Amino acid sequence: LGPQVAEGENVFGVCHIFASFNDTFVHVTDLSGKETICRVTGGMKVKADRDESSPYAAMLAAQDVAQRCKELGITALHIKLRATGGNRTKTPGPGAQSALRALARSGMKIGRIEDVTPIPSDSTRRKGGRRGRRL
RNA sequence: GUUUUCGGAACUGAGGCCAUGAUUAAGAGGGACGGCCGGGGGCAUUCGUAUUGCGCCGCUAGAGGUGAAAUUCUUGGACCG
Numbered sequence: 001l002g003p004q005v006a007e008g009e010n011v012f013g014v015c016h017i018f019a020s021f022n023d024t025f026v027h028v029t030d031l032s033g034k035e036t037i038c039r040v041t042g043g044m045k046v047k048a049d050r051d052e053s054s055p056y057a058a059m060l061a062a063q064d065v066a067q068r069c070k071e072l073g074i075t076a077l078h079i080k081l082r083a084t085g086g087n088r089t090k091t092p093g094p095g096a097q098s099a100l101r102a103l104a105r106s107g108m109k110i111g112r113i114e115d116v117t118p119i120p121s122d123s124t125r126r127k128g129g130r131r132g133r134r135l
Numbered sequence: 136g137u138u139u140u141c142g143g144a145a146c147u148g149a150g151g152c153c154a155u156g157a158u159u160a161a162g163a164g165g166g167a168c169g170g171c172c173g174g175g176g177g178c179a180u181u182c183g184u185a186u187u188g189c190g191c192c193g194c195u196a197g198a199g200g201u202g203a204a205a206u207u208c209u210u211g212g213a214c215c216g
Contacts, residue, residue, distance in 0.1 A: 022200065022201095029216050032193095036193050037193090038194065050203065118185060123185045124185075
């Protein structure tokens, strides 16, 4: 079970670390993007809606996802870090570098680093009011 | 009784003469013309990513939002690629 190749060559999957402030996602996928493997979020580790985006919650989100693909023989990953973008914040969540460091310390290797977050040319109306979030 | 002259008006045709007759071109304005310039205006056409909805595939029980939660969507398979 796995790619029938010599271990000196490094196979490639792509992970899409969708970092936000509600939670952080780690969604490893093959190089096509079509047939995905496993989606170990940051919220699956701790049972607290406050701690759903903590930098430790992505330390454990990218430790279990480095065991399902190591079970299938994947040794080097492609990283597409993505903040929520669109009309919301285009600055990455705090649980992003921690999910990278847990992927780079669990024996796995990296490929390319690339920032695909949805930025518009220009978009529709923002969620709040004209006077904004009065808080 | 007639007829002139002059007087005084009113109107036309030649000629001479006028040093014959137009103040300049506003560090005022209008209008030409010349090469440019500008997210000026209108009509037609064209491109972009995003958002939302829909079709199919993948892997799966969480996802949304908050100072914290909760109203809300999920194998009448959500979020994610």
